[PDB]
Design an enzyme around this catalytic site. Sequence first.
Site, PDB file in Angstrom:
ATOM      1  N   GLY A 186     -22.609  25.217  10.488  1.00  0.00           N
ATOM      2  CA  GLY A 186     -21.449  26.057  10.705  1.00  0.00           C
ATOM      3  C   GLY A 186     -20.270  25.345  11.334  1.00  0.00           C
ATOM      4  O   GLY A 186     -20.068  25.406  12.547  1.00  0.00           O
TER       5      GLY A 186
ATOM      6  N   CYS B 151       0.765  -1.265   0.000  1.00  0.00           N
ATOM      7  CA  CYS B 151       0.000   0.000   0.000  1.00  0.00           C
ATOM      8  C   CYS B 151       0.784   1.296   0.000  1.00  0.00           C
ATOM      9  O   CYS B 151       0.549   2.159  -0.829  1.00  0.00           O
ATOM     10  CB  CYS B 151      -0.929   0.036   1.203  1.00  0.00           C
TER      11      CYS B 151
ATOM     12  N   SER C 140     -19.027  22.805   4.048  1.00  0.00           N
ATOM     13  CA  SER C 140     -17.570  22.865   3.904  1.00  0.00           C
ATOM     14  C   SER C 140     -16.885  21.517   4.043  1.00  0.00           C
ATOM     15  O   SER C 140     -15.928  21.235   3.330  1.00  0.00           O
ATOM     16  CB  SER C 140     -16.975  23.849   4.911  1.00  0.00           C
TER      17      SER C 140
ATOM     18  N   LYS D 142     -30.361  24.200  -3.168  1.00  0.00           N
ATOM     19  CA  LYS D 142     -29.663  25.470  -3.181  1.00  0.00           C
ATOM     20  C   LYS D 142     -30.823  26.471  -3.137  1.00  0.00           C
ATOM     21  O   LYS D 142     -31.925  26.161  -3.591  1.00  0.00           O
ATOM     22  CB  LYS D 142     -28.876  25.610  -4.480  1.00  0.00           C
TER      23      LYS D 142
ATOM     24  N   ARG E 110      16.399  -9.435  -0.756  1.00  0.00           N
ATOM     25  CA  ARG E 110      15.023  -9.135  -1.142  1.00  0.00           C
ATOM     26  C   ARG E 110      14.070  -9.001   0.045  1.00  0.00           C
ATOM     27  O   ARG E 110      12.851  -9.016  -0.123  1.00  0.00           O
ATOM     28  CB  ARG E 110      14.482 -10.193  -2.098  1.00  0.00           C
TER      29      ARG E 110
ATOM     30  N   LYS F 242     -33.582  30.759   8.357  1.00  0.00           N
ATOM     31  CA  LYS F 242     -32.135  30.626   8.436  1.00  0.00           C
ATOM     32  C   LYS F 242     -31.564  31.967   8.846  1.00  0.00           C
ATOM     33  O   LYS F 242     -31.418  32.867   8.011  1.00  0.00           O
ATOM     34  CB  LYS F 242     -31.534  30.212   7.096  1.00  0.00           C
TER      35      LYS F 242
ATOM     36  N   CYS G 276     -31.599  38.772   1.701  1.00  0.00           N
ATOM     37  CA  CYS G 276     -31.989  39.752   0.686  1.00  0.00           C
ATOM     38  C   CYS G 276     -31.934  41.175   1.282  1.00  0.00           C
ATOM     39  O   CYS G 276     -32.027  41.375   2.489  1.00  0.00           O
ATOM     40  CB  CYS G 276     -33.353  39.407   0.157  1.00  0.00           C
TER      41      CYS G 276
ATOM     42  N   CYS H 232       0.996  23.219  24.646  1.00  0.00           N
ATOM     43  CA  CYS H 232       1.814  22.017  24.761  1.00  0.00           C
ATOM     44  C   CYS H 232       1.527  21.188  23.520  1.00  0.00           C
ATOM     45  O   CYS H 232       0.359  20.983  23.162  1.00  0.00           O
ATOM     46  CB  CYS H 232       1.441  21.216  26.012  1.00  0.00           C
TER      47      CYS H 232
ATOM     48  N   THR I 203       2.839 -12.856   2.260  1.00  0.00           N
ATOM     49  CA  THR I 203       2.500 -12.020   3.391  1.00  0.00           C
ATOM     50  C   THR I 203       1.246 -12.474   4.100  1.00  0.00           C
ATOM     51  O   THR I 203       0.471 -13.271   3.579  1.00  0.00           O
ATOM     52  CB  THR I 203       2.267 -10.608   2.926  1.00  0.00           C
TER      53      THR I 203
ATOM     54  N   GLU J 292      -6.496 -27.464  13.854  1.00  0.00           N
ATOM     55  CA  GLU J 292      -5.121 -27.032  14.003  1.00  0.00           C
ATOM     56  C   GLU J 292      -4.254 -28.136  14.559  1.00  0.00           C
ATOM     57  O   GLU J 292      -4.611 -28.771  15.548  1.00  0.00           O
ATOM     58  CB  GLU J 292      -5.071 -25.815  14.923  1.00  0.00           C
TER      59      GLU J 292
HETATM   60  O1  LIG Z   1     -22.670  34.652   1.688  1.00  0.00           O
HETATM   61  C1  LIG Z   1     -22.258  33.604   1.249  1.00  0.00           C
HETATM   62  O2  LIG Z   1     -20.961  33.322   1.382  1.00  0.00           O
HETATM   63  C2  LIG Z   1     -23.128  32.577   0.566  1.00  0.00           C
HETATM   64  C3  LIG Z   1     -24.593  32.912   0.497  1.00  0.00           C
HETATM   65  C4  LIG Z   1     -25.108  33.571  -0.600  1.00  0.00           C
HETATM   66  C5  LIG Z   1     -26.511  33.860  -0.635  1.00  0.00           C
HETATM   67  O3  LIG Z   1     -27.029  34.435  -1.563  1.00  0.00           O
HETATM   68  N1  LIG Z   1     -27.207  33.439   0.455  1.00  0.00           N
HETATM   69  C6  LIG Z   1     -26.735  32.786   1.560  1.00  0.00           C
HETATM   70  O4  LIG Z   1     -27.461  32.456   2.478  1.00  0.00           O
HETATM   71  N2  LIG Z   1     -25.402  32.530   1.559  1.00  0.00           N
END
Ligand SMILES: O=C(O)Cc1cc(=O)[nH]c(=O)[nH]1
EC number: 1.3.1.2
Lengths: 1010, 1017
Positions: free
Chosen positions: A790, A135, A813, A573, A370, A705, A670, A986, A487, A217
């Site tokens: 987050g 490996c 992320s 999305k 070897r 949100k 927004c 540490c 092995t 065995e």
């Molecule tokens: O701000 C960011 O990095 C990503 C983001 C874009 C957006 O339109 N809405 C949202 O909640 N998050």
Amino acid sequence: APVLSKDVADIESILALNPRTQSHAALHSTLAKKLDKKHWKRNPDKNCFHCEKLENNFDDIKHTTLGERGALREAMRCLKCADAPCQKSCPTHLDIKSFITSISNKNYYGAAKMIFSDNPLGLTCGMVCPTSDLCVGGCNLYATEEGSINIGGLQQFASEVFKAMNIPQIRNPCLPSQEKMPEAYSAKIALLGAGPASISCASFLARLGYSDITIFEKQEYVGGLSTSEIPQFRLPYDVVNFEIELMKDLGVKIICGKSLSENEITLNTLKEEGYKAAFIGIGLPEPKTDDIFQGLTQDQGFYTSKDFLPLVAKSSKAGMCACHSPLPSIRGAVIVLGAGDTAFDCATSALRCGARRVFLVFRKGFVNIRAVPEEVELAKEEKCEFLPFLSPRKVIVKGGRIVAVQFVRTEQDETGKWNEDEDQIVHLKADVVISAFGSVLRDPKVKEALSPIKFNRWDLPEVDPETMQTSEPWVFAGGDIVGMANTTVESVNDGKQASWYIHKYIQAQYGASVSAKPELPLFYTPVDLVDISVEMAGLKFINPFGLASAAPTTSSSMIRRAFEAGWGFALTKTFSLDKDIVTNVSPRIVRGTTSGPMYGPGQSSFLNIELISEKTAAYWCQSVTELKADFPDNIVIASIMCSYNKNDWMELSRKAEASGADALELNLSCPHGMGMGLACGQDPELVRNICRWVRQAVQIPFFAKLTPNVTDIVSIARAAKEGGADGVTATNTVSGLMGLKADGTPWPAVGAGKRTTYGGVSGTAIRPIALRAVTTIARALPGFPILATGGIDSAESGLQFLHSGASVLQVCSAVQNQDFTVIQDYCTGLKALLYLKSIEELQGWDGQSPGTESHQKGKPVPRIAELMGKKLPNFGPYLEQRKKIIAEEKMRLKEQLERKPFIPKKPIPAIKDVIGKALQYLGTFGELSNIEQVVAVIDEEMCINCGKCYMTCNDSGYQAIQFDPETHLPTVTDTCTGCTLCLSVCPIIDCIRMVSRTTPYEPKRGLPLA
Amino acid sequence: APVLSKDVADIESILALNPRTQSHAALHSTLAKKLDKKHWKRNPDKNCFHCEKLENNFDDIKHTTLGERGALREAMRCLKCADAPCQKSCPTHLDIKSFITSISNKNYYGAAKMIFSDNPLGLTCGMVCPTSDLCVGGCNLYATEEGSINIGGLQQFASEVFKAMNIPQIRNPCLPSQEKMPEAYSAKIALLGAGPASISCASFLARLGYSDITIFEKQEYVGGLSTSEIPQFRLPYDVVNFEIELMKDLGVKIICGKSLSENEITLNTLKEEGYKAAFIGIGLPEPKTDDIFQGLTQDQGFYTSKDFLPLVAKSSKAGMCACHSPLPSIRGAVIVLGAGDTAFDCATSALRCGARRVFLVFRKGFVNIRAVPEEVELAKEEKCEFLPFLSPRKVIVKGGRIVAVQFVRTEQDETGKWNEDEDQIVHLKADVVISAFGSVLRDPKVKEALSPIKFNRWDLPEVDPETMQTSEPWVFAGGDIVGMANTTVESVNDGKQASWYIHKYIQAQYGASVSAKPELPLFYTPVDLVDISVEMAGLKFINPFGLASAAPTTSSSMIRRAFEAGWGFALTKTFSLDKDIVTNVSPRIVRGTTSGPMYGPGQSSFLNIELISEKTAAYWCQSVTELKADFPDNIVIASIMCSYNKNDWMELSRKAEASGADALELNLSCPHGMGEMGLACGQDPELVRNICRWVRQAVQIPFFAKLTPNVTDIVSIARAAKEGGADGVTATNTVSGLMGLKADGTPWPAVGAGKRTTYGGVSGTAIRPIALRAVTTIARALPGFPILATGGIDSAESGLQFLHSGASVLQVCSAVQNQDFTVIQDYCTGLKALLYLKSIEELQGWDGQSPGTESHQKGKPVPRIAELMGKKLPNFGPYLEQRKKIIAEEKMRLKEQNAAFPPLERKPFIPKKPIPAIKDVIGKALQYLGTFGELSNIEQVVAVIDEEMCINCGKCYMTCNDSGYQAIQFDPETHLPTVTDTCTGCTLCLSVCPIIDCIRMVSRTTPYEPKRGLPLA
Ligand SMILES: O=C(O)Cc1cc(=O)[nH]c(=O)[nH]1
Ligand code: SF4
């Protein structure tokens, strides 16, 4: 009034070794240096012709062994490659990427589970596999200055942690109950030899459901070579037992004392007894002998690997044999003939027997050895000598004992052939001779017991390389006996390989067929039964993990794969009405500089200036209907966004609900339209209103949100609860700038004008923020649903959010840094976590992390009395003393436990039972006791003498640590205030610990008060 | 309407290698595995008995050589220990901790400066020092599974980058002007041999001020052994020239063609010529000969290291000899006698000459080889054979060519004595023999030229081990000639050691004395002249770096040391009136989990529940007075805090100013216990404006408001303070957060047996993105308004980022908690370098101190061979095999050219524009900031991968697959990625690639068209 801003004599003295930049170049004669260099020496002295004494020293010498601390780093260093080459280079196809991912996530069980799923002898292979030729040989990171990943040690560690947990194996929970199993599965299966091959095989056979598997065995001990010859100092016998028991958990039966030879067990007697199929895995039982050693006996000083090693085995492996035997008395110069890998275990083992000197003499050159390099290195470092181009010819015996060996030189000519010049004799002194020429199957009695299986030219049973089937349909073989495997991992794979086909065959015999595609079962334990489902706002989540509205959910196609992978839920999305269609710029997603110049896996953060979805609401709502149609138990939540407009919010929210969405998520990012922040999510009033509009528009639960970029998130959290929301998602990305080049230009840099705007920070770097946000909202509006997001990237972290009041966990992320499969890690990880909360004997652990034991380089610190509290650091003359004291102890010991599973002594908690349990500990500052002060206490046995704690306390603390100028060992004095910075820097986990202060605490005011 | 949430055939195909978790165990025969294993092989095949052909292949073979990406990891891995043992193990006492710290901070110049301050041959040593036996030998990290720090490579890199910058050396800028230097310094000094010893020595001598230093080199080439024998594939000759030139910048003069012999140069001729002092550094010029080799010549096939190595050197090192030198034609079996380290350079070198086989034959055992292991492994891996326990006795010649060597076996008796059994002869074939028994000083013509210096019993000049002074007061020696040094670094040190005392002596001769404590100068360059001072709010900062009100300033005693270290300014821990005395809890300061389970140096953040100062205002105010009394040029800013009460804010604020504080900083972290903008004063603009008014009318010295980031709009609080009268704002304080819980749900820090805690403050690099925004945003809103930045500063470069965003001075904390006060040195020398480079025209392709990344592998440049580019040959398996062949073919081709390679033109880079000053760069980065609408969505980009730099992990592939647009193809055989036209330029891949600059974003050539999924109406 003394000079307040000046260190008193005492303190100036304590800072004697504190770092200060010099104003001139240092002056130190070359001679003074020479004399001083020996004091700090940490590694081997190239000018040292000896080495400590190793007699009866069977401590682990593996260079790969890792401790948790170290396992975690390497685990994190691993790139976790796609179609990884290391797995392709592994005989048993271990999903290295996956198990290593699990380890960097502290999900040892999951890692352990993945390893044993494809290798029943996981722990052993992790310790002995010659990784450099397997490996690690294909490790992508070999293409970096740092080098390939220590896959072996990593496997060793995860397996060791698992073994410590004391969890038993169990049949696949999906298999029919015992009684409901077809007749075929009760056929009598028999295996010869309890070696890797057979142990592997029977295990898989047992996984498939077979109820009558017996291993015969010959010897009185099990485990084969792994027990009889591989050194205790490389592979502890305790490991073998561990893996053997795991097997037994599935019912496999082992009977020692039975052999495969005429007059004993034979293919015929087995057929006659009713055995439907048999697996031969006895290996190569006999030593390869040579003429010139005829008549020679042990008393004289002659052994063959097959004679020697087993003796040391039985002697040093407690539990192998019942009879405690002596350690062979090998004194004087030893000569090991051969340069096979066996030869080297003989060499190193010989030293443990008391050998004064050991010479490895092979008939070829150095370049012709070897044996795996790692194996050779051990010998070489324990000072074994090498003598190349010498072929044995005679063993001169005088006085009934050997005294020398006569050789003849060899040499390789043009054509590349080897000649032995019978003219150039060679006399080499010797008190003992061990031949490591190999092993074979000669005993005609055994060869017969296998009749009438056909044998090939190598005088070994012939099997179809793919089916492991011999000339007789009910007979399969594998392991060393077949001659392909070199092995343990390969022989294990042989047993495994054979298992499937033995299965195919037995089934056929009962007029039953098996799938076209091989379906060998995975490894399973009670942990896998734990229920990790949860209900929130009336929604039933099969598991708490879900994809958050972001990159990982750019296309519904992705969500599908996500569900297929097993994700509990996902967010589309964010999408909007046609009039609000957006268009993204590029670059728009960049890595975080929050953790320094560290590139590759595990980025501490990302920043992005990406807008909502560029895909139409038409696309999404259709996609939603589709998804919920094919995945009815996976919750799909649609993320919608509209300007501050009631008709819009209601239009869109109905459309989404109409598509079948389980629930909705309101993206309050927004702009309001007038100049609290610019965004809707920052103004409680607006939040409350938007929530009302949607509440009245749809029936399905919806959540708000919340953004973390507000002076008080609890206020907008409340305003949404007041507005009608069924819960809040906390939180969105933290606004920030990720950096600039030296030229002042930003990154991301859009267009030729190299422009950018404030983006959103996501990743582990914002977890502290999201966590506070979740725990604050959790105490203010108790019971109110919180979907956390987050910095979640592992089951443990996710558990943290559950403990903080969240019910479900959103991820982004972590998948950008990896891929959808992390879901597997998260679930197996959360399961293990909850399962362990029921084990009483494992309360000293923190999750899956055992309690840290004093160790150095991962291996434990010897508890010898002559070492404790002596202040002997692991370097220079001190190390010399340590080694002597340790050797002295081994000699003294020369003059001088049942494995049971842990049972849950309590019901396994369920998600609901842990949500918010961490809240009780949170309070204001006034509720924190300032009478219960603490101080730091250092464990000199774990310390690596860096002096980091010293410097922190010196330039960021109370100058409360003394740093000896000779041993570089720290000592916290009682001026310590317990700030806890030292412990924090540490580099050794748990080397420093905070303990209750025993003396009275008295704040340092500098100047008394009036 | 096709099924929208389903990948189409083409995309399912592209995802073929994307990771998916398995439902069952894998079935793969042991045989199938064996056959497949060789396709991914990355490292050596333990079963292969022959290393690729190396004829005329002088590429760098050092295992330690690092690239920037790699150097940065290791640099960060370094614990940067106190009273570091590696430094104690270094013969030149290089402050490793410091130079490695500078590297981790991207301050290569600072690193380079540190190294050269104690080792004029820094770059060379970094490539040849047998670290295993020196510095690395005592590395504390040896006590970790990962192992000791590659100090050598780290030094090599920093040195290499510095060399690239083309900056000259200059005399200590604080020395008197040339003409104002005492007579003594014009003394004629002479050094024999232009070798490391002399080179180091003359250099230090020149640093001290001496203007007449001349080195007399025997040969026509300079650099000593480092040129004549050490292999080009271990130490490139142009490194030697680099360091020699650096010396010359200080006026030292070198004259080749002159020798120290009874006929030409002698101690007497020098004395008679007026030379006041001379340093002998000729080393051991002759090879150790043995009788059995009497009469043998090169034509027969015999050489001594001293004969052979210099030939290969002259031939492989362009710039050494002007003459064209033939590469010795060594064909057949080569026999190197000896196991010294030179023996090994001979073995490896021999291969380069065409040797078919090379045998290293020594008279003792394997355990007896005293060459450093790293050096032995080189040979071993290039497949050199070893033959122990053999002593040579006779050399056979037939036709006038060697053909065999006769040996006798050796062995040890129980008494440890080696005997040679004259009876057991050994015939070993051989077409060439090279003896590496060592070197010595025999030539009586030379030994005479040293009269009347006393020689010891080793027949080498005798010198006082401490002063390097021989029996004659005006004569010193050092390096190999003395017989103690076994390394370049040690001979360098000898020259160095000797330098001081030569100094002491010369001065004495002129009736002048020298300091009691040795004061050898540091290394200096024009970059050190850069001015990094700045004016802000009427305060003059000697340099923009300062300690932020926090742990690093818990006691004024610490601030003192901080100033002593050179910090531009400092903040007193925040203090208040007696009635507001506080008492801290514990634990209260913990490490950040923001970067995973990484323990040790470089913590990404800290979280703390520490209150203000526990020390009285009495203490602080006196402390301030004492501090400003002792450090008049170091700005001291007192951080004060009071409830929302005018009298108090004015009382305290006056007391502070009264103590003499240069300015004040308002800690707006006290609650405003008024109902329902959060709880703290700093969160309400009205309250901020007011407190600022109270203080404005109470004192006259400037004061600033330290804004908190935990607000919906920081600019509003920033304005409110400007309106309230403040002369500036500090941005920003710690971000409110929770650092985590254990598995059992209990937090950390956990106070008391009840294990309770409260929301703490997050500091460190993890909050820089927040602090930076904060700063840039307040910078655009209130232009010109003074901003003291704080939040994640830990290096010159990051600091410059805050200056570029509108801050004028930079506060520091977490960075010092992770290290210590000396980081200041790094910061200043760092910022210096940065501004300085901005004026160099030829270095614009660089990003600060980082050169432009070049196609590399494991830190080594990729050969630009025509038959190698765009062939899709990854560095593994059979592909690697082909690569090696193609490269050896190329080397053979290059040999057939015998083209002489043009000399060396190392010319310093001159600033073609004035060096910017702090004021000239503050806020310069603000121009690029704008709203999102100001961002062009027509100028789209896509990613383009450099297959030559790629390490085939497939991370880009996976990001784009599960976090992107399935735009990357990952070949199943070469594991090479290829971005397709479906790319949208999101840039995630580039973000996750582990190789720096392997992936780059380029302008989209094909029109961009957003993916709507379903068209619009
Ligand atoms: O701000 C960011 O990095 C990503 C983001 C874009 C957006 O339109 N809405 C949202 O909640 N998050
Ligand atoms: S100059 Fe050499 S001996 Fe010293 S710190 Fe560098 S590589 Fe180690």
